[PDB]
Amino acid sequence: SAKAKRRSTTGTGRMRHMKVVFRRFRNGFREGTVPKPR
Amino acid sequence: AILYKRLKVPPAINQFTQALDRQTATQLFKLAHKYRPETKHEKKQRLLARPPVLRAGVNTVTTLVESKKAQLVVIAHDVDPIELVVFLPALCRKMGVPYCIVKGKARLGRLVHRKTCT
Amino acid sequence: APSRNGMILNPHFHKDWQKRVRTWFNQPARKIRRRKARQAKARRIAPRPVSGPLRPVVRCPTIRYHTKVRAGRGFTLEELKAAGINKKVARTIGISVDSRRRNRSTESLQANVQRLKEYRTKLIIFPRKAAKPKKGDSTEEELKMATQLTGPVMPIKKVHKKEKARVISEDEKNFKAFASLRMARANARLFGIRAKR
Amino acid sequence: PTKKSKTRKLRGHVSHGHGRVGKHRKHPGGRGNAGGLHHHRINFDKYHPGYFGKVGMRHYHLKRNTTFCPTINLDKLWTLVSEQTRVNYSQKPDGPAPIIDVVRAGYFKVLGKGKLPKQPVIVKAKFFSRRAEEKIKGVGGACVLTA
Amino acid sequence: AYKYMQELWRKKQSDVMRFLLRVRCWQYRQLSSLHRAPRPTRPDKARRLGYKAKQGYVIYRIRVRRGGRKRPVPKGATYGKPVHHGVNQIKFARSLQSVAEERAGRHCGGLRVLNSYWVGEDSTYKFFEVILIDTFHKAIRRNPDTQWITKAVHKHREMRGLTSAGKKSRGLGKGHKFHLTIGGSRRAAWKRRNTLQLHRYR
Amino acid sequence: VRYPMAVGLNKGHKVTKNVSKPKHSRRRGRLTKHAKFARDLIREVCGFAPYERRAMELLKVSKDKRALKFIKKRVGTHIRAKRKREELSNTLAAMRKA
Amino acid sequence: QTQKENLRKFYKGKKYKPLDLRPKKTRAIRRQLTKHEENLMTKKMQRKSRLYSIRKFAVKA
RNA sequence: CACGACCUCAGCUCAGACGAGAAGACCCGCUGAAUUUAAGCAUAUUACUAAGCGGAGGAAAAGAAACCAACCGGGAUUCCCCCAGUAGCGGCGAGCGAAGAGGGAAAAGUCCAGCGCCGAAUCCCCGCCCCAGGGCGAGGGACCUGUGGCGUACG
RNA sequence: UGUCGGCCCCCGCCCCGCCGGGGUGCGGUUCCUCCCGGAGUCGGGUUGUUUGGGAAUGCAGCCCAAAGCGGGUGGUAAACU
RNA sequence: CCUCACUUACCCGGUG
Numbered sequence A: 001s002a003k004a005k006r007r008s009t010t011g012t013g014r015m016r017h018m019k020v021v022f023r024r025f026r027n028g029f030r031e032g033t034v035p036k037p038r
Numbered sequence B: 001a002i003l004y005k006r007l008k009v010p011p012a013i014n015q016f017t018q019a020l021d022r023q024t025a026t027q028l029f030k031l032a033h034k035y036r037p038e039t040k041h042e043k044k045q046r047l048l049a050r051p052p053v054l055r056a057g058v059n060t061v062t063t064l065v066e067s068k069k070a071q072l073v074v075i076a077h078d079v080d081p082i083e084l085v086v087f088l089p090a091l092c093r094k095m096g097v098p099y100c101i102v103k104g105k106a107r108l109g110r111l112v113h114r115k116t117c118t
Numbered sequence C: 001a002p003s004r005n006g007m008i009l010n011p012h013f014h015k016d017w018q019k020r021v022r023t024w025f026n027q028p029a030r031k032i033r034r035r036k037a038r039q040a041k042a043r044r045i046a047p048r049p050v051s052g053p054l055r056p057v058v059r060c061p062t063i064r065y066h067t068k069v070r071a072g073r074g075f076t077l078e079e080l081k082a083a084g085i086n087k088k089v090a091r092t093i094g095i096s097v098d099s100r101r102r103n104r105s106t107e108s109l110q111a112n113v114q115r116l117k118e119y120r121t122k123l124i125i126f127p128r129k130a131a132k133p134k135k136g137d138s139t140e141e142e143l144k145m146a147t148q149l150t151g152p153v154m155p156i157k158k159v160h161k162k163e164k165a166r167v168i169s170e171d172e173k174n175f176k177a178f179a180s181l182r183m184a185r186a187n188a189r190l191f192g193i194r195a196k197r
Numbered sequence D: 001p002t003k004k005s006k007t008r009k010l011r012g013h014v015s016h017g018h019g020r021v022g023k024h025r026k027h028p029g030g031r032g033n034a035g036g037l038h039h040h041r042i043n044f045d046k047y048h049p050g051y052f053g054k055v056g057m058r059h060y061h062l063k064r065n066t067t068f069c070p071t072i073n074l075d076k077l078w079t080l081v082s083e084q085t086r087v088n089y090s091q092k093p094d095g096p097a098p099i100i101d102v103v104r105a106g107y108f109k110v111l112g113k114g115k116l117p118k119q120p121v122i123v124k125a126k127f128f129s130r131r132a133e134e135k136i137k138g139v140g141g142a143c144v145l146t147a
Numbered sequence E: 001a002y003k004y005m006q007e008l009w010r011k012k013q014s015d016v017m018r019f020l021l022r023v024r025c026w027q028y029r030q031l032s033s034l035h036r037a038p039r040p041t042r043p044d045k046a047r048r049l050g051y052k053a054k055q056g057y058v059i060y061r062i063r064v065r066r067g068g069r070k071r072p073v074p075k076g077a078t079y080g081k082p083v084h085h086g087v088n089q090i091k092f093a094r095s096l097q098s099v100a101e102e103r104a105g106r107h108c109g110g111l112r113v114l115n116s117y118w119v120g121e122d123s124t125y126k127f128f129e130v131i132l133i134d135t136f137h138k139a140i141r142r143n144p145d146t147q148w149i150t151k152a153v154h155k156h157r158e159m160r161g162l163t164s165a166g167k168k169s170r171g172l173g174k175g176h177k178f179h180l181t182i183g184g185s186r187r188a189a190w191k192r193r194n195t196l197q198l199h200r201y202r
Numbered sequence F: 001v002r003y004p005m006a007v008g009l010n011k012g013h014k015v016t017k018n019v020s021k022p023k024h025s026r027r028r029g030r031l032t033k034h035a036k037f038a039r040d041l042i043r044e045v046c047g048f049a050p051y052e053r054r055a056m057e058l059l060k061v062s063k064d065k066r067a068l069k070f071i072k073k074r075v076g077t078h079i080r081a082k083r084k085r086e087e088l089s090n091t092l093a094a095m096r097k098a
Numbered sequence G: 001q002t003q004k005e006n007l008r009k010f011y012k013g014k015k016y017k018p019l020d021l022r023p024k025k026t027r028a029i030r031r032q033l034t035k036h037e038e039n040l041m042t043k044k045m046q047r048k049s050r051l052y053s054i055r056k057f058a059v060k061a
Numbered sequence H: 001c002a003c004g005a006c007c008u009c010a011g012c013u014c015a016g017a018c019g020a021g022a023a024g025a026c027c028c029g030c031u032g033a034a035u036u037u038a039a040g041c042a043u044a045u046u047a048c049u050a051a052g053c054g055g056a057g058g059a060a061a062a063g064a065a066a067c068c069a070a071c072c073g074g075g076a077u078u079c080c081c082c083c084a085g086u087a088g089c090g091g092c093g094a095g096c097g098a099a100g101a102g103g104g105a106a107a108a109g110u111c112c113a114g115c116g117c118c119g120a121a122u123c124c125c126c127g128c129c130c131c132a133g134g135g136c137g138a139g140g141g142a143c144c145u146g147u148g149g150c151g152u153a154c155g
Numbered sequence I: 001u002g003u004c005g006g007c008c009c010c011c012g013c014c015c016c017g018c019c020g021g022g023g024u025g026c027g028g029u030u031c032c033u034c035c036c037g038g039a040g041u042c043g044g045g046u047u048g049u050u051u052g053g054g055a056a057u058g059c060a061g062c063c064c065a066a067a068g069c070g071g072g073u074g075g076u077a078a079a080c081u
Numbered sequence J: 001c002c003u004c005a006c007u008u009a010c011c012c013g014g015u016g
Ligand SMILES: [Mg+2]
Pocket: C001, C002, C003
């Protein structure tokens, strides 16, 4: 059942934490550091 | 332990039941006490300062009797698995090295400052 | 199904072949990809040749490729020993080595020993430190005139040497070529039945 | 393309070129080579005699490089050398004869089909037929064998 | 000493080993089907398969119900053609030793199956001792000669036919005997030989 | 007067053969003094398998053909049956010598 | 973020830090060999890399 | 007849870690059909497919020969071209069907066990001293039922 | 948009040079000596399956059960070579 | 080969 798999696969919901990994990946999973202040 | 008494144990395994006498084993460890391997607590003082000894381990005593450099080999009786020392009495007999079987692999281990020496 | 004279066709399309159909639409894209990989590799090994280590000259096995030579896998340990090159230093200077190959004849052995000697003369070795030129390292003059070698390292030449026109000897004209092969075939079949005597 | 297709001129015609009585259906006689012995026997026997049955011995691991033996006839024997070479030694028929190594050109056996020009020639091949050799011997020249 | 242990284990029908196999197969069937051994019963065979006396190498004794593989069909009803009516004389494609190491690696998810060896047999049981490795112990992660098993690519290698016992069932190897698994697996070869290579210019 | 043919007993392109030491892998399975000492020692510790023990019973009553058919049924190949029967005969000969 | 700034300063240099103060890169990334363990070389390949490393060379033709 | 050593086996919300699920196009290990074709049909075919189960990674698997070959010999693996709809398999019916060589892409090789030398020369934990890289503790363990160095078919 | 044009802020690879903590020599020997190997595994029988593999390609179950100038392979079963 | 014995394999029953 491809339709049943389509309705409840990853990406059909919020992806509260997986969408953040997508944003963190494009920056190299940078942690601990902060942008240079003004 | 009772199954070892019901079944016919082959002589290559039953040979470890006939161990050394309590009087003979007492004086045997008195001589081996003067050749105990040096502990690491005292071996550091031998290095930072500025010899016959026992050779433990079944792999060491095997190449020792093969080269007939061992003057006396002491085998334990409760070695499990027994295949580690099944060949030892026959190996020491063919090579002409006197071998004895004492009771307690732990007493051999305390002789070399470890848990169990084979 | 058969209408008139024609071949008995056998199309192997009785499985689910539509699930396994590889289209070559990225064929010109993998040519650009493989080309960029050679260029990217060439910069990483900038002084060293991009084609890799020097390959030996081997003979193709079967009788169909009898007279054909080919770039082999690696130089035999015997070929390195006859050239004064250690086993574990040949990889450091870009010489392909494989220990599986053997030399069944001296023609193949002498052909690669000369190839190894010709390579070591054309080899410009840089010192491990520029401030310390050691023995095996080349001179400071040849280091400046040392560029990356494109193409195969010492491509194999197929010398099309021609037998010179000789005068046909009278003993050569009396050679029965058909009878020689016909006797060789017959003696090779009756060889075992003759050894029983 | 589809511009010159026959289906473009069958628009409007009902049966689309497949008959009203006997319509075009899904395999009215079987799929593929079906019925080759029962109802397509006449077609198989008339156009493919020998299609059914076994003949000859089996060779399990047949390697085509073992039986590789390319042949060449005597009419194309001088094609392995340049035309000027064949002419230069025609004016010198008193012993200087060219050598045509057939092995290095890609052939093993030499067959005596065509006629050979009246020139002595040394032919090097792995195999020779009886008539190819005697035509080389008759025209002058030897048949050197090679392995 | 280890040389005499392997030659001693080759005389299995001798009264010396026949007694040991008799009394150990009895003891092994009094424990649970899955039971951790305190030390290898075969130190010679364990070292030969990659076992070391470091911290992180554990041994698990597995008792598998030996014999064939009965087709799990209800009342032997395989609805189909008579070729598939076999319910009894069906043999598992994977070895019994592979079932034992796959059963020890499933119960111990935090460990990786290194190898396995034979310790006993019976008319109903085959006993194997599996060598497992704690890939997060510092005595193993700091040893460069064994850091390979700490990689994520070796997760449950016993369940993918990568261990010696499971890799034997794959039919791989160099030669004319193994033309079915050219290209890695047999499905990699089947997919390559059944893929219609439609070129750009054809 | 004679050229190298591609057929017959002396077939092949004539080249000088290169002689060299064999591959070290080809010494596999050669009995050393230590390997013979270990197997002869354990032979004294273990004894003989039930099929080796009863095949020597057929060898002492001069039934080498029945001893061969029995060992061939046990170990399999006929080439392995001769080597086993030859070894059991050497052991049986060394027994009656003592 | 003022409280965690003191917490990351208090647990600095400690062997065991709270889970929320540890780098949350990725479950797979956190389980990889550290840069210390990746740089570890056995004494055999330390010698193999000392005298049998690839040389810098060039070939004329 | 308690006190010790050891073995084997337990307990813990003990100290510190690990596993689980998701996804699953590609990948690995199993399991497994029948529509369908054979103008019926039972082997065959469909197909070592669909579905089912397990396990991964950015690739996986494979892999440095118990290989190919029979030659003037090739030389890990993977992929492409060709081999080749060929050898062969098959109610020898329907159908099925590789491999060696050759040409290319890419190329990189290696570690143990064992064998026997080296005073276990080895490792972990804990508590620390200096600058991820180095040391220390008459601290606790692991280990001789074998850690490390040398060394693996090319000797 | 075109100009690897300009400016600004993060960030990386490789090579070279000095200083610092850990590194430890390797080759050639028609010379001596010593050592050299993966068992319920191979193989055999049988069964099922798989394969183009056909007196059995691979795999597995059960039985048998190794050897060490041995063992495997050499596309037809077998013995000898 | 067959029968009768042995208990420790294996099997069954009882029991807090
Ligand atoms: Mg028609």
